[PDB]
Structure 1
Amino acid sequence: GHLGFLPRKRAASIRARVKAFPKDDRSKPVALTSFLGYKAGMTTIVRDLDRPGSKFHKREVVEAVTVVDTPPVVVVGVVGYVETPRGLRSLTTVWAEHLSDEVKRRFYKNWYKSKKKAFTKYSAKYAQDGAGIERELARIKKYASVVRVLVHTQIRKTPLAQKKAHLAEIQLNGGSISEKVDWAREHFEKTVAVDSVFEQNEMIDAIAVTKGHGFEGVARAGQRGYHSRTSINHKIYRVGKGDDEANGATSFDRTKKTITPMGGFVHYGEIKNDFIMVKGCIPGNRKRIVTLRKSLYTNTSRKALEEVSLKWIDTASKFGKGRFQTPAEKHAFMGTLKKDL
């Protein structure tokens, strides 16, 4: 096999942490560098191909895309790291004073038995003109060469029966560390949307813990699957919206439909919020939390520069076989049934 992907062992957690970040330019505006959601879905798209030099210039191509569900990420903190001869070293983290039920749930393994007394003295530590919070924020701005944002996911807006959101750390590639820590100050308790991180025609690297297959039998026997994998260069085809109906509508199809198939995806619900439709196949299975970083570097070929003109979204039944896009088209083709009249 590949000797790089060793030791071929089970990961530390389902939420794999992002190993490296995109560099930094100290003149660029403040913007997030990685996003997270919940991968669950896969679907077929057709599009006309404006890729000149190819055998399919001004032709139409069918291809497989994946739908990661991405509820609006909520900022609950910021971390500052000093540059040492020993690597980086977190000197101060700061939180949001009033955090959701989801994250106070993340701080316990057994949620129901506890008195739910998580950040009581920390919120009481805030309870004045600031004084100590602004002291720690001065501490971050004075030192700390890089600044990373503590976020979490909106787990309840996702159909998952987990209730327990994931903490993460996302660096900022907007220059002047002052603007980093003050962007964070403008964003405590607030939420960050998907399309404020990504857009169409943008290459990303989705990282995921790879679908556990359990025990398996130099070509050696042992563990197969459940490894933390980084896959790079998956083009974003569509960023979606929850409130907006006709997400499944293209420039061509234009029928008022959601990208959610009939009876939803298999083993996972519908979509009730923002999503990213990424091309190809992201690692992990359905219901799996994926962390989407962006490219690391200027990765422009013509596979990264071209504009996607989506023509049609397959929303037919994945559970079973596909014959109808809408429920409306099932009973339009069928005629009327027994229990109808």
Structure 2
Amino acid sequence: GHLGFLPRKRAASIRARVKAFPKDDRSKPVALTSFLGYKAGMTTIVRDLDRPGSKFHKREVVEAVTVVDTPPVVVVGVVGYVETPRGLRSLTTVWAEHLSDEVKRRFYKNWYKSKKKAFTKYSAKYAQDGAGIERELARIKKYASVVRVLVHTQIRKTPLAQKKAHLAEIQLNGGSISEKVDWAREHFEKTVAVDSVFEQNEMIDAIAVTKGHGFEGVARAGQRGYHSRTSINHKIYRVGKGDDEANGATSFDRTKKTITPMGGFVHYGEIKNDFIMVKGCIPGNRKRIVTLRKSLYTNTSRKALEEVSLKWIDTASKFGKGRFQTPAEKHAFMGTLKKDL
């Protein structure tokens, strides 16, 4: 096999942490560098191909895309790291004073038995003109060469029966560390949307813990699957919206439909919020939390520069076989049934 992907062992957690970040330019505006959601879905798209030099210039191509569900990420903190001869070293983290039920749930393994007394003295530590919070924020701005944002996911807006959101750390590639820590100050308790991180025609690297297959039998026997994998260069085809109906509508199809198939995806619900439709196949299975970083570097070929003109979204039944896009088209083709009249 590949000797790089060793030791071929089970990961530390389902939420794999992002190993490296995109560099930094100290003149660029403040913007997030990685996003997270919940991968669950896969679907077929057709599009006309404006890729000149190819055998399919001004032709149409069918291809497989994946739908990661991405509820609006909520900022609950910021971390500052000093540059040492020993690597980086977190000197101060700061939180949001009033955090959701989801994250106070993340701080316990057994949620129901506890008195739910998580950040009581920390919120009481805030309870004045600030004084100590602004002291720690001065501490971050004075030192700390890089600044990373503590976020979490909106787990309840996702159909998952987990209730327990994931903490993460996302660096900022907007220059002047002052603007980093003050962007964070403008964003405590607030939420960050998907399309404020990504857009169409943008290459990303989705990282995921790879679908556990359990025990398996130099070509050696042992563990197969459940490894933390980084896959790079998956083009974003569509960023979606929850409130907006006709997400499944293209420039061509234009029928008022959601990208959610009939009876939803298999083993996972519908979509009730923002999503990213990424091309190809992201690692992990359905219901799996994926962390989407962006490219690391200027990765422009013509596979990264071209504009996607989506023509049609397959929303037919994945559970079973596909014959109808809408429920409306099933009973339009069928005629009327027994229990109808």
Question: TM-score higher than 0.5 here?
Answer: yes
Q: How does 1:186-197 map to 2 (within 5 A)?
A: 186-197=186-197
Report how far residue 47 of structure 1 moved.
0.0
Query: Shift of residue 137 of structure 1?
Result: 0.0
Deviations 1:186-234 (A, max 9, x none): 0000000000000000000000000000000000000000000000000
Q: Distance in 1 between matches of 2:71 and 2:276?
A: 10
Separation in structure 2 between the aligned mates of residue 55 and residue 239 of structure 1, nearest angstrom? 28
Deviation at 1:120, TM superposition (A): 0.0
What is the rounded CA distance, in whole Å, between the counterparts of 2:84 and 2:318 in structure 1?
A: 52
Deviation at 1:307, TM superposition (A): 0.0
Deviations 1:79-106 (A, max 9, x none): 0000000000000000000000000000
Displacement after TM superposition at 1:135 (Å): 0.0
Moved over 6 A (4+): none
Structure 1 residue matching 2:45: 3-state secondary structure: strand
Q: Note the C-alpha offset of 1:329.
A: 0.0
After superposition, give the CA deviation of every residue in 1:46-93 in whole Å (9 maximum; x if it has no partner). 000000000000000000000000000000000000000000000000
Q: Distance in 1 between matches of 2:165 and 2:132?
A: 28
1:115 corresponds in structure 2 to 115
1:137-168 Cα offsets, whole Å, 9 max, x none, are 00000000000000000000000000000000
- Identical-residue share of aligned pairs (%): 100
- Whole-Å separation in 2 of the counterparts to 1:296 and 1:17: 15
Question: 2:185 aligns to what?
Answer: 185
Aligned partner of residue 20 in structure 2, secondary structure: coil
Distance (Å, rounded) in 2 between the aligned partners of 1:323 and 1:2: 41
Q: Secondary structure at the match of 2:140?
A: helix
Q: Secondary structure at the match of 2:170?
A: strand
- 1-structure distance, mates of 2:119, 2:45: 47
Q: Equivalents in 1 of 2:16, 2:43: separation in Å?
A: 25
TM-score between both structures, scaled by the size of structure 1: 1.00
Partner of 2:231: 231
Number of residue pairs matched by the alignment: 341
CA distance in 2, matches of 1:146, 1:38: 27
Map residues 186-335 of structure 1 onto 2, 5 A cutoff.
186-335=186-335
Q: 1:176 Cα deviation (Å)?
A: 0.0
Deviations 1:102-146 (A, max 9, x none): 000000000000000000000000000000000000000000000
Superposed CA offset, 1:286-323 (max 9, x none)? 00000000000000000000000000000000000000
Unmatched 5+ stretches in structure 1: none
Structure-1 separation of matches of 2:231 and 2:40: 17
> In the alignment, which residue of structure 2 is the partner of 1:165?
165
CA distance in 1, matches of 2:246, 2:21: 35
SS state at 1:11 partner: coil
Paired residue secondary structure (2:248): coil
- For 1:276 and 1:51, locate their aligned partners in 2 and report how far apart those are by CA, in whole Å: 23
Determine helix, strand or coil for the equivalent of 2:194.
coil
Q: CA deviation at 1:29?
A: 0.0
Distance in 2 separating the partners of 1:279 and 1:67: 9
Q: In structure 2, how many angstroms separate the alpha carbons of the residues matched to 1:257 and 1:301?
A: 33
CA displacement 1:238-270 (0-9 Å, x = unmatched): 000000000000000000000000000000000
User: How many Å separate the matches in 1 of 2:250 and 2:34?
Assistant: 27
- Pairwise CA distance, 1:25: 0.0
Q: What SS does structure 1 have at the residue aligned with 2:56?
A: coil
- Report the Cα offset of residue 284 of structure 1: 0.0
* Deviation of the 1:27 alpha carbon: 0.0
